[PDB]
Amino acid sequence: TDNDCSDGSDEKNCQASGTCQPTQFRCPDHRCISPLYVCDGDKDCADGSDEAGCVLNCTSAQFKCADGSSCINSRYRCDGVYDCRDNSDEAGCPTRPPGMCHLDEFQCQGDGTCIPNTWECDGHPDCIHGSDEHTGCVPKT
């Protein structure tokens, strides 16, 4: 029922015989439909026959909401933004130990804030009293 050919050639002689192609799924009394729309989170048939009764699936590059309501991309896991409705993504994210900093971070002795290791001994005092450019830093020839 979609005018793909832009001239209606792919929708000519379409009949209610209910004899869709093997690949195409058949809504009970609505239309045939492509597999790529079966179980895709969207009700494409009138009665939602193409979506009801199925279950979600995920590659190694995706993450499951706790309630099974979505398969979000793994990039959005532990990002500071609630994506899943049940907030299953940002729960259990790594917490910086009390008043310290992660392994990837130098800590400014002047105020306790954290900056990446890549900024320690880089010639630019990032910390508020220049703690990150201490005299222990190797001189750059």
Partner 1 sequence: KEFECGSGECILRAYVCDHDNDCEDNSDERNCNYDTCGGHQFTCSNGQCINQNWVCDGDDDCQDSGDEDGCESNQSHHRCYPREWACPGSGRCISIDKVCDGVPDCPEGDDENNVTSGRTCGMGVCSVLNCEYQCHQTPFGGECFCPPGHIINSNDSRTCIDFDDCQIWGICDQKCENRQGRHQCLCEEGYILERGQHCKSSDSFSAASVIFSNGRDLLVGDLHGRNFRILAESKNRGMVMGVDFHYQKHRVFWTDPMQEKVFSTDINGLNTQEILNVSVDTPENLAVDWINNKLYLVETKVNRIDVVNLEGNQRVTLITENLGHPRGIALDPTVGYLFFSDWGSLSGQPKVERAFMDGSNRKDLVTTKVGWPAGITLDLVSKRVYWVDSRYDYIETVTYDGIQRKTVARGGSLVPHPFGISLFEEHVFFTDWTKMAVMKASKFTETNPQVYHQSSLRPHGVTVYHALRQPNATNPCGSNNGGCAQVCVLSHRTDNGGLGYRCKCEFGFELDDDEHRCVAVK
Ligand X SMILES: *[C@H]1O[C@H](CO)[C@H](O)[C@H](O)[C@H]1NC(C)=O
Note whether 38 and 25 are within 8 A (CB). yes
Q: Which residue is nearest to ligand NAG (CB)?
A: 57
Asked whether position 71 contacts partner 1 by CB under 8 A, the answer is no
Asked whether position 67 contacts partner 1 by CB under 8 A, the answer is no
The interface region with ligand X, picked from 70-78, 83-91, 92-100, 114-122 by CB under 6 A, is 92-100
Radius of gyration (C-alpha) of the chain in whole angstroms:
28
Pick out residues in 40-59 that bind partner 1 (CB under 8 A).
44-46
Pick out residues in 54-93 that bind Ca ion (CB under 5 A).
76, 79, 81, 83, 89
Note whether 62 and 74 are within 8 A (CB). yes
Asked whether position 31 contacts partner 1 by CB under 8 A, the answer is yes
Helix, strand, or coil (residue 114): strand
List for the chain the helix, strand, coil content (%; round to 5).
Answer: 10, 10, 80
Pick out residues in 54-93 that bind ligand NAG (CB under 6 A).
57-59
Longest dimension (CA), the chain: 85
Find which of ligand NAG, partner 1, ligand X, none residue 98 binds, CB within 5 to 8 Å per kind: ligand X
Nearest in space to 51 (alpha carbons), one of 29, 71, 33, 74:
33
Q: Tell me which residues touch Ca ion (CB under 5 A).
A: 1, 37, 40, 42, 44, 50-51, 76, 79, 81, 83, 89, 119, 122, 124, 126, 132
